[PDB]
Design a binder for these strands. Structure first.
Ligand SMILES: [Mg+2]
Ligand SMILES: [Mg+2]
Ligand SMILES: [Mg+2]
Ligand SMILES: [Mg+2]
Ligand SMILES: [Mg+2]
Ligand SMILES: [Mg+2]
Ligand SMILES: [Mg+2]
Ligand SMILES: [Mg+2]
Ligand SMILES: [Mg+2]
Ligand SMILES: [Mg+2]
Ligand SMILES: [Mg+2]
Ligand SMILES: [Mg+2]
Ligand SMILES: [Mg+2]
Ligand SMILES: [Mg+2]
Ligand SMILES: [Mg+2]
Ligand SMILES: [Mg+2]
Ligand SMILES: [Mg+2]
Ligand SMILES: [Mg+2]
Ligand SMILES: [Mg+2]
Ligand SMILES: [Mg+2]
Ligand SMILES: [Mg+2]
Ligand SMILES: [Mg+2]
Ligand SMILES: [Mg+2]
Ligand SMILES: [Mg+2]
Ligand SMILES: [Mg+2]
Ligand SMILES: [Mg+2]
Ligand SMILES: [Mg+2]
Ligand SMILES: [Mg+2]
Ligand SMILES: [Mg+2]
Ligand SMILES: [Mg+2]
Ligand SMILES: [Mg+2]
Ligand SMILES: [Mg+2]
Ligand SMILES: [Mg+2]
Ligand SMILES: [Mg+2]
Ligand SMILES: [Mg+2]
Ligand SMILES: [Mg+2]
Ligand SMILES: [Mg+2]
Ligand SMILES: [Mg+2]
Ligand SMILES: [Mg+2]
Ligand SMILES: [Mg+2]
Ligand SMILES: [Mg+2]
Ligand SMILES: [Mg+2]
Ligand SMILES: [Mg+2]
Ligand SMILES: [Mg+2]
Ligand SMILES: [Mg+2]
Ligand SMILES: [Mg+2]
Ligand SMILES: [Mg+2]
Ligand SMILES: [Mg+2]
Ligand SMILES: [Mg+2]
Ligand SMILES: [Mg+2]
Ligand SMILES: [Mg+2]
Ligand SMILES: [Mg+2]
Ligand SMILES: [Mg+2]
Ligand SMILES: [Mg+2]
Ligand SMILES: [Mg+2]
Ligand SMILES: [Mg+2]
Ligand SMILES: [Mg+2]
Ligand SMILES: [Mg+2]
Ligand SMILES: [Mg+2]
Ligand SMILES: [Mg+2]
Ligand SMILES: [Mg+2]
Ligand SMILES: [Mg+2]
Ligand SMILES: [Mg+2]
Ligand SMILES: [Mg+2]
Ligand SMILES: [Mg+2]
Ligand SMILES: [Mg+2]
Ligand SMILES: [Mg+2]
Ligand SMILES: [Mg+2]
Ligand SMILES: [Mg+2]
Ligand SMILES: [Mg+2]
Ligand SMILES: [Mg+2]
Ligand SMILES: [Mg+2]
Ligand SMILES: [Mg+2]
Ligand SMILES: [Mg+2]
Ligand SMILES: [Mg+2]
Ligand SMILES: [Mg+2]
Ligand SMILES: [Mg+2]
Ligand SMILES: [Mg+2]
Ligand SMILES: [Mg+2]
Ligand SMILES: [Mg+2]
Ligand SMILES: [Mg+2]
Ligand SMILES: [Mg+2]
Ligand SMILES: [Mg+2]
Ligand SMILES: [Mg+2]
Ligand SMILES: [Mg+2]
Ligand SMILES: [Mg+2]
Ligand SMILES: [Mg+2]
Ligand SMILES: [Mg+2]
Ligand SMILES: [Mg+2]
Ligand SMILES: [Mg+2]
Ligand SMILES: [Mg+2]
Ligand SMILES: [Mg+2]
Ligand SMILES: [Mg+2]
Lengths: 205, 121, 82, 80, 157, 129
RNA sequence: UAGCUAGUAGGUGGGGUAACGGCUCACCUAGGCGACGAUCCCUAGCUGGUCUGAGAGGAUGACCAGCCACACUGGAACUGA
RNA sequence: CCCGCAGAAGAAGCACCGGCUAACUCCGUGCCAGCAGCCGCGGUAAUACGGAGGGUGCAAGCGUUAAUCGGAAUUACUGGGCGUAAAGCGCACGCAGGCGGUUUGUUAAGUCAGAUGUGAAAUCCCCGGGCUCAACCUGGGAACUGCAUCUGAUACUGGCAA
């Protein structure tokens, strides 16, 4: 159901920073990033065309915290939906509640936001929600309940979100822990690094 | 070819025979087992491959390979058979399921133990 | 005898009745002449709840079709002037 | 109008009945070529009006034997 | 305007009195990503020397490809040796859904999204020629308009 | 032994263009003049005649733009061994609508483009790319 | 599997069927089906569909829905709309 | 379904890692023991066997087996062939059958167009809606590629003349 292993290991294998152990401090410099996936980390990979597709897929999964069964279901919805298949894959991932709760700044990491969603803290449109996979519809108002409001984990985690890029598609109040999801996320607004095309290539065959 | 020739005699679809006659699309089948014995393979190999004649329940009489190191099979002993050619012993086109029935698990395995029917350490 | 009765579809603990014109001898979910609206007991106060096409009811009740104990109550529920 | 069928006679040697072929030019489902398919019906007629080798109009009606549910309407283009 | 890439590398033998000497063959295709394509075979004793020899021939052996926006004009065949090769234009959506070797030549040419399939044999050399034979052949509406001497709109519309 | 005359016409055009030949003589017919005129009207062929009283010989005059011929490819679809009649909506479009398919419809012989707008289908004689 | 077929194929008349009919009789005629596959043999419930496929097709017909068939095996009628 | 309690507490495996195919070393063994979906690994320095470490891929599932289609344009109607690769009967005549030069007719069988009836509901598909989300249920639409009849069209094909 979840990964729950060594989290920074995933970042070295992938190479780039996945925001798995982003947390309170900004930059890590505490793993030998890039040049140590495992024991044989100095081994330069040949890396085939199937490889780069699989690496790109596993990167996007590990960032958002989704497994292949649920991830392959996002592709099947993305294909049936209008527009472009690549843009739909990532737009559906960004619409998850655990992802939105992270992007609002109610969680230092995405795993922290996931637990915060799961443990009856998060509440949207006057209704409590436990499901991390909850597809946040356009024009919504996610927030934290008054019992768990201003607890020790959230106030520190919200100060981290000032250093972050902060999305344009959503807005945060910051005083009373109240968020507002407005429009669907655009491609050019976020990332500008994770390739969608290669993930579409993995599943079409 | 020739559309009139096809109207008169349609495309006869190649009914490709199955590799493993166990019948009625069965995953596995019981076998009472007779003659447990060793046999030599084809050309580049050279070994003593462990194998047994299986008296299947439906009527058939087939040979099946005994995978892993060492076995408890002898004379009789009821065993379970799955499909799979060995590709070395010509004629042997089945495998004994290690773990099922009188066929025990392989002794002292760690890696790949669903294959070879061994429990945790 | 033709009769207007509920069909019972929907999930477990989550019923959804298709009110339908069928022969008395045919099974509940089985054969029918034509469906004529629906009923949802777990709908509550929202947009949709219960629909019942009253034009087709005149074609069957006017000729000679019985109305079941529950469907007769939904004709009273939909009302003539309320 | 009455739902008739044209058809050339195959034989009339039965006493008050006639067997009539109906050539229908349907196409082949798979291969798309048009086939010349045949439909031999048994047909009723009062007296020996029609002979061998001539076109005949035929109507569907009551069954009046084992086979022979079709019945004659009129004659068009007699035998050569 | 490089956009150069390698399809296949394949070692090939000669056999002489002494023994057998191995050389390597490359197969590179290059293009600007805007209607120019060029395969180059190239062979040499060593592997990396073969690909530079291939990349040199690929640049000079170039063919023009008149294509619509980021896709083909019409469904096109292009037979060569034992590779049939079929490829349909397709719409603004999708990506290049084609086989390896057949999609190296397509992506560097500048077609962003096409249907495609290699029937027959799928030898990397012959399928790359089979595509380029098709893409050279693949005429545009502006060419067809001038060819008959009628009108660009009356043909199209 | 000469079963399809229309296929034979379309070979003489095809083989004449391969040879780089100016004119293409052949026996005339009702269906020959109808197809030849449709090819002329759009602009594959550059003028033709039907010279003869008793034994008429319809000769075409093939068109060339560059060194290459104008008729890229031309093939029989509804051959006599297998007649092919397509419905209004199911009518084809050769080369994604920049080549024509000559189609014998109920209101005379015409192109596939004119058949769509006129509101009818028929026997698709030949694709012309 | 190349010929099968004598109530068999049709008529007139009587009986019988809720209803028409070789449904069944008596006589009369000599047919009828058959290479666009009868007869015989092996296999099979059928459809809406399911799965697959770019589509054509290929496979399949558990669950839900229609129709048929059968009820220990082989027969017959009684009762009844 | 809600609310209080107690404390990370009760809650992770099992495939694989020579190429196809994402991921490598070291010991043990020595064409033995064994592996193997295809090619193939093992003959004393094994990335392929067994263990160990390390990795990769899935994760309350995972693999193995069997079963169908796909890829297979490897029964090819869309879409293959038959000089030498599998494949022109040894060569004729010829009925049934398939196909048929050319111009007038003329019907309307095919063909085409239109129109009405029907193609049960579910299923599929699209826009909604309801279960905290999903699967699931569900409203409406489209569709059900069809078959029938009915009116027309005559270019083509058939028929019948000349
Ligand atoms: Mg799960
Ligand atoms: Mg799950
Ligand atoms: Mg595919
Ligand atoms: Mg063919
Ligand atoms: Mg009944
Ligand atoms: Mg109530
Ligand atoms: Mg009868
Ligand atoms: Mg010499
Ligand atoms: Mg091949
Ligand atoms: Mg004339
Ligand atoms: Mg004359
Ligand atoms: Mg004349
Ligand atoms: Mg009765
Ligand atoms: Mg279906
Ligand atoms: Mg599907
Ligand atoms: Mg599909
Ligand atoms: Mg296919
Ligand atoms: Mg079937
Ligand atoms: Mg069946
Ligand atoms: Mg089944
Ligand atoms: Mg059952
Ligand atoms: Mg059930
Ligand atoms: Mg049941
Ligand atoms: Mg049933
Ligand atoms: Mg019935
Ligand atoms: Mg019945
Ligand atoms: Mg019964
Ligand atoms: Mg019964
Ligand atoms: Mg019973
Ligand atoms: Mg009985
Ligand atoms: Mg009985
Ligand atoms: Mg009673
Ligand atoms: Mg009675
Ligand atoms: Mg009665
Ligand atoms: Mg604690
Ligand atoms: Mg613990
Ligand atoms: Mg030792
Ligand atoms: Mg030794
Ligand atoms: Mg030895
Ligand atoms: Mg030994
Ligand atoms: Mg192994
Ligand atoms: Mg070898
Ligand atoms: Mg050695
Ligand atoms: Mg060693
Ligand atoms: Mg090795
Ligand atoms: Mg291996
Ligand atoms: Mg090993
Ligand atoms: Mg090992
Ligand atoms: Mg690991
Ligand atoms: Mg591990
Ligand atoms: Mg499972
Ligand atoms: Mg499984
Ligand atoms: Mg299989
Ligand atoms: Mg196939
Ligand atoms: Mg196969
Ligand atoms: Mg072949
Ligand atoms: Mg030949
Ligand atoms: Mg030969
Ligand atoms: Mg030959
Ligand atoms: Mg010969
Ligand atoms: Mg002879
Ligand atoms: Mg003919
Ligand atoms: Mg003819
Ligand atoms: Mg003619
Ligand atoms: Mg003829
Ligand atoms: Mg003529
Ligand atoms: Mg005239
Ligand atoms: Mg006229
Ligand atoms: Mg006229
Ligand atoms: Mg007229
Ligand atoms: Mg008229
Ligand atoms: Mg007609
Ligand atoms: Mg008419
Ligand atoms: Mg008329
Ligand atoms: Mg018609
Ligand atoms: Mg029509
Ligand atoms: Mg119509
Ligand atoms: Mg329906
Ligand atoms: Mg379907
Ligand atoms: Mg919802
Ligand atoms: Mg909602
Ligand atoms: Mg619905
Ligand atoms: Mg509906
Ligand atoms: Mg509708
Ligand atoms: Mg339907
Ligand atoms: Mg249907
Ligand atoms: Mg219809
Ligand atoms: Mg009709
Ligand atoms: Mg009519
Ligand atoms: Mg009329
Ligand atoms: Mg005429
Ligand atoms: Mg004619
Ligand atoms: Mg005529």
């Amino acid at each position: 159901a979840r990964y729950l292993g060594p989290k920074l290991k995933l970042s070295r294998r992938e190479g780039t920073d996945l925001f798995l152990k982003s947390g309170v401090r900004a930059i890590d410099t505490k793993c030998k990033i890039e040049q140590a996936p495992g024991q044989h980390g100095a081994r330069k990979p040949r890396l085939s065309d199937y490889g780069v597709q699989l690496r790109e897929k596993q990167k996007v999964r590990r960032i958002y915290g989704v497994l292949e069964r649920q991830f392959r279901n996002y592709y099947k919805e993305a294909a049936r939906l209008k527009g472009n298949t690549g843009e739909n894959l990532l737009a559906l991932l960004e619409g998850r509640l655990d992802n939105v709760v992270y992007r609002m700044g109610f969680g230092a990491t995405r795993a922290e936001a996931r637990q915060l969603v799961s443990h009856k803290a998060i509440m949207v449109n006057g209704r409590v929600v436990n499901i991390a996979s909850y597809q946040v519809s356009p024009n919504d108002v996610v927030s934290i309940r008054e019992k768990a409001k201003k607890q020790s984990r959230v106030k520190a985690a919200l100060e981290l979100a000032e250093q972050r890029e902060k999305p344009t598609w959503l807005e945060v109040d910051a005083g009373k822990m109240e968020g507002t999801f407005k429009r669907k996320p655009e491609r050019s607004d976020l990332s500008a690094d994770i390739n969608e095309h290669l993930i579409v290539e993995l599943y079409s065959k | 070819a020739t559309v009139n020739q096809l109207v008169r005699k349609p495309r006869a679809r190649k009914v490709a025979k199955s590799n493993v006659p166990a019948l009625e699309a069965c995953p596995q089948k019981r076998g009472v087992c007779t003659r447990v014995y060793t046999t030599t393979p084809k050309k580049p190999n050279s070994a003593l491959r462990k194998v047994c004649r299986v008296r299947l329940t439906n009527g058939f009489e087939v040979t099946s390979y005994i995978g892993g190191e060492g076995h408890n099979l002898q004379e009789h002993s009821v065993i379970l058979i799955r499909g799979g050619r060995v590709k070395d012993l010509p004629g042997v086109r089945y495998h004994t399921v290690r773990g099922a029935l009188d066929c025990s698990g392989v002794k002292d395995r760690k890696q790949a133990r669903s294959k070879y029917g061994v429990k945790r350490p | 005898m033709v009769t207007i009765r509920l069909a019972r579809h929907g999930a477990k603990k989550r019923p959804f009745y298709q009110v339908v014109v069928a022969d008395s001898r045919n099974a509940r979910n089985g054969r029918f002449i034509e469906r004529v609206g629906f009923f949802n007991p777990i709908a509550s106060e929202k947009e949709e709840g219960t629909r019942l096409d009253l034009d087709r009811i005149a074609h069957w009740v006017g000729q000679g079709a019985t109305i079941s104990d529950r469907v007769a109550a939904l004709i009273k529920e939909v009302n003539k002037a309320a | 109008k009455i739902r008739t069928l044209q058809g050339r006679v195959v034989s009339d040697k039965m006493e008050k009945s006639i067997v009539v072929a109906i050539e229908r030019f349907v196409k082949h489902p798979i291969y798309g070529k048009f086939i010349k398919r045949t439909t031999k019906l048994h047909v009723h007629d009062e007296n020996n009006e029609c002979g061998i080798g001539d076109v005949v109009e035929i109507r569907e009606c009551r069954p009046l034997s084992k086979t022979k549910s079709w019945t004659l309407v009129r004659v068009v283009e007699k035998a050569v | 305007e490089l956009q150069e890439k390698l399809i296949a590398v394949n070692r090939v033998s000669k056999t002489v009195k002494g023994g057998r000497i191995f050389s390597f063959t490359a197969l590179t295709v290059v293009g600007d990503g805007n209607g120019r394509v060029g395969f180059g075979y190239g062979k040499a004793r060593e592997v990396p020397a073969a690909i530079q020899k291939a990349m040199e021939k690929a640049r000079r052996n170039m063919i023009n490809v008149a294509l619509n926006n980021g896709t083909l004009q019409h469904p096109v065949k292009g037979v060569h040796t034992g590779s049939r090769v079929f490829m349909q234009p397709a719409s603004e959506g999708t990506g290049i859904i084609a086989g390896g070797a057949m999609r190296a030549v397509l992506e560097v040419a500048g077609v962003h999204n096409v249907l495609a399939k290699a029937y027959g044999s799928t030898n990397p050399i012959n399928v790359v020629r089979a595509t380029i034979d098709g893409l050279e052949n693949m005429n545009s509406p502006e060419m067809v308009a001038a060819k008959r001497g009628k009108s660009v709109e009356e043909i199209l519309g | 032994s000469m079963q399809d005359p229309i296929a034979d016409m379309l070979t003489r055009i095809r083989n004449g263009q391969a040879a780089n030949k100016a004119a293409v003589t052949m026996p005339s017919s009702k269906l020959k003049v109808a197809i030849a005129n449709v090819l002329k009207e759009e602009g594959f062929i550059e003028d033709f005649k039907v010279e003869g009283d008793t034994k008429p010989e319809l000769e075409l005059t093939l068109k060339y733009f560059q060194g290459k011929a104008v008729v890229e490819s031309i093939q029989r679809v509804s051959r006599p061994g297998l007649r092919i009649y397509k419905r209004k909506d199911e009518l084809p479009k050769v080369m994604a609508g920049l080549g024509i398919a000559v189609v014998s419809t109920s209101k005379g012989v015409m192109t596939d483009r004119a058949a769509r707008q006129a509101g009818l289908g028929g026997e698709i004689i030949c694709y012309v790319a």
